[PDB]
Amino acid sequence: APDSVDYRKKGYVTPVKNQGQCGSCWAFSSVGALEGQLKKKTGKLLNLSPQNLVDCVSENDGCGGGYMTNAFQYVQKNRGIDSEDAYPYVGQEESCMYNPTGKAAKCRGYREIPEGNEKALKRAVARVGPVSVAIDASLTSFQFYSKGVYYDESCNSDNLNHAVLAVGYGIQKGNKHWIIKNSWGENWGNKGYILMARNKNNACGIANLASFPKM
Numbered sequence: 086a087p088d089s090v091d092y093r094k095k096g097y098v099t100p101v102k103n104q105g106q107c108g109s110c111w112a113f114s115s116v117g118a119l120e121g122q123l124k125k126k127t128g129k130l131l132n133l134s135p136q137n138l139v140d141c142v143s144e145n146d147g148c149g150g151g152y153m154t155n156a157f158q159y160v161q162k163n164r165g166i167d168s169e170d171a172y173p174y175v176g177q178e179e180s181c182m183y184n185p186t187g188k189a190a191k192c193r194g195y196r197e198i199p200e201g202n203e204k205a206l207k208r209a210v211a212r213v214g215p216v217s218v219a220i221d222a223s224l225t226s227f228q229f230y231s232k233g234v235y236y237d238e239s240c241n242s243d244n245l246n247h248a249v250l251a252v253g254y255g256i257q258k259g260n261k262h263w264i265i266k267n268s269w270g271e272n273w274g275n276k277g278y279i280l281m282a283r284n285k286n287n288a289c290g291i292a293n294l295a296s297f298p299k300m
């Protein structure tokens with residue numbers, strides 16, 4: 086695998102979104118991983134619909150939370166996911182209103198990264214593209230991030246509570262990092278992104294619940 090990778094440079098990453106009050110981070114994370122595979126497969130980048138996932142993944146809990154693997158399994162079983170423009174985000178769970186005419190991507194399954202293994206996460210990001218990951222994002226230090234490679238000794242790898250998207254990895258001032266796209270809008274963090282410590286004892290649980298879709 087290369088020493089550094091940044092899929093934003095390859096045009097695999099759509100603009101940062103803002104989930105608002107709804108606990109739909111898992112849907113934004115899943116959509117971002119699908120967007121990356123869609124760009125890799127077809128050469129064209131398009132925003133996909135987290136609302137379609139919120140409303141239609143019955144194995145998840147909508148705005149109450151969910152898993153990315155369940156979202157990928159739904160897209161595969163459903164034979165598609167709608168674009169964002171065809172099924173816009175409204176910030177609350179509704180009945181499933183998927184419309185196949187708005188289909189903009191398909192999924193052929195998924196893979197999970199071995200639990201806790203940041204080297205395997207790195208190899209997946211290098212081989213595949215952006216990977217969905219879960220972290221402890223509860224600390225106010227995480228929430229107030231602005232610059233640098235984030236590390237807080239108090240982060241708890243056993244307390245996963247948010248889902249984000251690893252769009253690359255690298256190093257800055259000698260500190261290995263993951264490049265993370267959040268879904269708290271561009272006013273959060275560094276234009277909506279955070280660099281998180283890599284190989285620092287699986288800081289914030291970054292490699293505990295990682296997965297990516299097949300296309």
Ligand SMILES: N=CCNC(=O)C1(NC(=O)c2ccc(N)c(F)c2)CCCCC1
Nearest residue numbers: 108109110146150151219245246247248
């Ligand atoms: N805005 C994001 C809220 N964070 C989540 O959705 C995470 N997942 C859950 O919180 C969850 C998962 C399955 C359920 N059935 C459920 F109710 C809740 C947190 C744990 C890691 C995966 C994502």
